[model samples]
Target: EFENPSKKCEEKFKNDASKMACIPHCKYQYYGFVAMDNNIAKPEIRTFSNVLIKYNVVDKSLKADIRKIMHECAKKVKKQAREDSHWLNCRTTINYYRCILTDKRIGPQRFDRAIQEYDKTINI
Candidate 1:
């Protein structure tokens, strides 16, 4: 029998609220997205971020700053992920974080823009 990571996250968030708060939601956002995995245990940042945004987490002033910071660093994170193909775990985590940062509500068209920017910068 395998254990679901999403269940673990639920337990973790409930039991370790202090740690969750201290680690910063940027990291938590990535971790949460990676942990969710839908039914097959895969990372889904758009679904994860949408849920958080729906929960009003994105609306808070302080949390909004964290999203902004994540957006600034998203490009570098994606570049690193795209380069490190052998390390699936590293690639998945970083890539998902990038998506979470540029999700529709939080970042609107920023995700596509970031992808285009990276594509151009890397190709050049």
Candidate 2:
């Protein structure tokens, strides 16, 4: 009876003819997430810069949506990590988000999917 959010991201990138160009920016968005993430020792400036560099790869709307999603992923990871009282959980959540970004077929809708993945992990 429940819906999956990660699939949303997957579906986003699933149709772009120029999806390859957008995928890297999405990964950069993940890096931006990792840098701001409290559960992992991710890169800072060098990481977040990728989004800036690849800004033109996608349209303005997609870019704006992805931007919010990336930070949301970071925030959710930290919050979930705290609830679990461990750092690994955050990293685990990041992995899913990163995976979404890595797949050119995935899009910004992964925000909910990343959270859903983390929830499933915790529930299990």
Candidate 3:
């Protein structure tokens, strides 16, 4: 849908070879179902590691290891969703891969993020 990428974002993404548009596997459901209008490629993966690779989150050399790590990370997101009956949306952003697992799940289930990290150290 987007012919041109943003200013800084496109520069980083231009190098990837296998980089592809996430179709038939873009919008992933918590239970592992994806719905896309492409109707082309049969389903392959669950998460957007392609998004990760496209932005060089995992370079060619370290891409192998990074995928394993990211795969687990993806599983954990879905696991948390199914286990607790809520959504875990780990929205990714380009140009900023800080070592922080920011939870962007602001849907109705977002309240779950609060009690998750909220400390009961000084109880009410």
Which is the leading candidate under TM-score? 2
Model 3 lDDT-worst window of ten: 91-100
TM-score versus the correct structure, for each prediction? 0.30, 0.34, 0.31
Give residue 14's lDDT in candidate 2 (0 to 100): 80
lDDT of 2 by residue, 14-103 (tens): 897645544433333444434323333334323332343344334444654545544555555456555554423224434435643653
RMSD of each: 14.4, 14.7, 17.3
Give the winner by TM-score: 1 or 3: 3
Model 3: per-residue Cα lDDT at residue 56: 46
lDDT of 3 by residue, 39-81 (tens): 1112323233343344443454654555454444445544444
lDDT, candidate 1, at 73: 45
Clashes found in each candidate (C-alpha, N, C closer than 3 A):
1, 3, 0
| Candidate scoring better on lDDT of 2 and 3 | 2
Give per-residue CA lDDT, model 1, range 39-116, as digits (tens).
Answer: 112234344434555445456444555445444445456555556545243244544455555544556354434333
- What lDDT is reached at residue 39 by model 1? 19
* Whole-model lDDT values for every prediction: 0.42, 0.43, 0.31
lDDT, residue 24, candidate 2: 36
Which pairs clash inside model 1?
Answer: 37-42
As a whole number from 0 to 100, the lDDT of residue 102 in candidate 1 is: 57
